[PDB]
Amino acid sequence: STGSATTTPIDSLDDAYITPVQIGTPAQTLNLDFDTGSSDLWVFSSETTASEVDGQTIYTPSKSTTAKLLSGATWSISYGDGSSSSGDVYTDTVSVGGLTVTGQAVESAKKVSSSFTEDSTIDGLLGLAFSTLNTVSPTQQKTFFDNAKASLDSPVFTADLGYHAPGTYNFGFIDTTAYTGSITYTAVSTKQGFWEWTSTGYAVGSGTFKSTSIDGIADTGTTLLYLPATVVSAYWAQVSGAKSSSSVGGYVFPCSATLPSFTFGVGSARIVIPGDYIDFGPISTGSSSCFGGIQSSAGIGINIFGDVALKAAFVVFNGATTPTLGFASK
Numbered sequence: 001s002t003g004s005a006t007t008t009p010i011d012s013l014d015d016a017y018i019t020p021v022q023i024g025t026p027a028q029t030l031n032l033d034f035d036t037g038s039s040d041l042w043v044f045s046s047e048t049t050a051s052e053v054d055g056q057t058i059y060t061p062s063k064s065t066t067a068k069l070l071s072g073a074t075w076s077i078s079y080g081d082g083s084s085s086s087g088d089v090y091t092d093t094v095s096v097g098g099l100t101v102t103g104q105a106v107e108s109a110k111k112v113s114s115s116f117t118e119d120s121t122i123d124g125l126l127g128l129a130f131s132t133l134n135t136v137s138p139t140q141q142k143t144f145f146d147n148a149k150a151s152l153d154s155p156v157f158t159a160d161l162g163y164h165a166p167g168t169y170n171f172g173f174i175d176t177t178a179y180t181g182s183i184t185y186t187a188v189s190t191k192q193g194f195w196e197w198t199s200t201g202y203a204v205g206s207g208t209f210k211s212t213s214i215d216g217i218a219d220t221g222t223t224l225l226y227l228p229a230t231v232v233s234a235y236w237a238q239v240s241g242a243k244s245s246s247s248v249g250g251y252v253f254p255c256s257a258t259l260p261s262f263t264f265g266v267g268s269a270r271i272v273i274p275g276d277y278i279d280f281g282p283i284s285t286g287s288s289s290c291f292g293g294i295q296s297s298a299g300i301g302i303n304i305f306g307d308v309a310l311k312a313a314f315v316v317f318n319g320a321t322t323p324t325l326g327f328a329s330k
């Protein structure tokens with residue numbers, strides 16, 4: 001079997017992407033943030049503290065004939081940005097673009113952090129990292145991808161994110177019309193539970209390509225690109241008036257500047273991120289200082305190939321027994 005669904009930016013800056021997901025019988029459609037950096041499927045629900053819900057669509061397990069409470073199971077998650085949420089667990093039927101999984105763990109949020117309450121457009125997350133990171137206690141639960149793996153024509157899913165435009169998540173097959181040239185595959189380490197790989201280097205604008213191993217994770221759930229300080233300093237040195245602002249918490253640049261592109265290596269192939277992708281607009285309404293989409297990972301402890309990088313490519317998450325990542329230009 002296969003599945004195909006459209007994913008759409010939540011705002012004019014591509015801060016996140018939402019994808020409709022059907023939960024329960026009869027279907028309740030929620031717009032989830034597909035997150036290859038985490039492994040929990042959790043939703044706003046009828047159980048969420050009422051003051052912490054501000055416009056989200058909620059899952060109501062009492063109205064699903066296939067919902068089963070998972071006795072004694074709880075969950076609690078903290079993300080790298082300080083966000084968090086927690087609650088109890090149901091099993092239910094979940095469908096993504098016509099691909100169905102019965103008995104999927106649906107984690108009902110009882111408590112959510114402020115950043116989630118303020119994002120009216122995201123009803124929950126669908127984690128697509130490896131199941132070892134799932135936070136359900138005392139019995140760990142599998143992700144949607146892991147549960148669907150056996151029924152899929154091929155144990156893969158692909159991420160085709162749009163720049164200021166809708167995109168596609170596909171499960172079970174690789175659309176050979178969605179990219180140009182060849183797909184370059186690279187080895188994945190699962191030892192930390194992430195889609196972790198090693199980039200072979202980078203270039204700034206038309207500059208010389210610098211061969212250097214950059215270890216990082218492919219994370220649809222993270223907006224920006226986070227790379228080591230040396231690389232990020234080399235990029236922003238090419239933008240007149242750019243500087244790192246402690247009060248703003250990152251590199252900023254004059255909104256009137258033109259940004260150079262950024263190239264990152266995948267084996268012997270190159271993925272080029274257009275400079276326009278690196279512009280995240282004014283730091284505040286009316287400001288002439290703009291926020292940059294390439295930031296330092298020094299404070300994070302790991303490099304993150306977030307949406308800024310991934311939307312420049314067609315990306316294959318190959319969940320074979322030896323997992324690999326595929327990158328192609330598009």
Ligand SMILES: NCc1ccc(C(F)(F)F)cc1
Nearest residue numbers: 037038079080219221222302
């Ligand atoms: N998108 C989920 C996510 C968020 C943060 C991290 C960090 F910070 F641990 F790298 C990993 C995964």
Ligand SMILES: NCc1ccc(C(F)(F)F)cc1
Nearest residue numbers: 035079083115116119221222
């Ligand atoms: N990396 C996972 C993640 C995704 C979205 C959010 C937001 F946007 F709700 F803050 C936080 C964390």
